[PDB]
Design a protein around this ligand. Sequence first.
Ligand SMILES: COc1ccc(S(=O)(=O)[C@H](CC(=O)O)C(F)F)cc1
Ligand SMILES: [Ca+2]
Ligand SMILES: [Ca+2]
Ligand SMILES: [Ca+2]
Ligand SMILES: [Cl-]
Ligand SMILES: [Cl-]
Ligand SMILES: [Zn+2]
Ligand SMILES: [Zn+2]
Length: 156
Amino acid sequence: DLKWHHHNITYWIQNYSEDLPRAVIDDAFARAFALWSAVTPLTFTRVYSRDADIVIQFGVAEHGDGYPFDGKDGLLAHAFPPGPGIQGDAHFDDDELWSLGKGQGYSLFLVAAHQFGHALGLDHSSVPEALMYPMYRFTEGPPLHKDDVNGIRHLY
Ligand SMILES: COc1ccc(S(=O)(=O)[C@H](CC(=O)O)C(F)F)cc1
Ligand SMILES: [Ca+2]
Ligand SMILES: [Ca+2]
Ligand SMILES: [Ca+2]
Ligand SMILES: [Cl-]
Ligand SMILES: [Cl-]
Ligand SMILES: [Zn+2]
Ligand SMILES: [Zn+2]
C-alpha cells in the first residue's frame, strides 16, 4: 500500500538468465522500464549497487523470500511493491524459457514490464488486454493499455 516518494528510480541487474545474452537482457529491461517512464515523470537509471530501488534477480525454487518458484511453467516471476529493503525487487523464474516476440517461451520483455508495474505499486488489472492482467498472453503492438496508463498516472 505504498508508492515511491521519488521519481528517480534506480535498478540493478543482479544476475542473468542462461536463456538470453546479457546485452539482450539489459535491452529487454531498459525497454520494459521505458514503457512506464514514457507515460509518467518517472525515470529509471541502471546502477551497480544493492542500494538500487529495484533489484532484478533470476532464481530457481527457493531464492531467499518465502515464495520459491515452481520450476517450468506456473509462477513465472514476481515483484515486491514499493518499500524499503526487498520491497521493490523483481524476481524471475530462470526455470522458465525466456525469449522475445513470437515463438515458444515467455517474453522477458513483456513479463518484466508487468513485474516492474508491481514494483512501482500497480495492482493487477481486470482488463484482459491490459499489461497488468494476471494472465500471461503474448501480444504485438503497444504493451500498455489505457487502464495501465491511468493506473500508473494515478500514482505518479
Ligand atoms: C504477462 O505478465 C505476467 C502476468 C502474470 C505473471 S505470473 O504468472 O507470475 C502471476 C503473478 C505475477 O504477476 O507476479 C500469477 F499468474 F498470478 C507473469 C507475467
Ligand atoms: Ca515457474
Ligand atoms: Ca531458463
Ligand atoms: Ca520466442
Ligand atoms: Cl549471472
Ligand atoms: Cl516480446
Ligand atoms: Zn522472489
Ligand atoms: Zn502480477
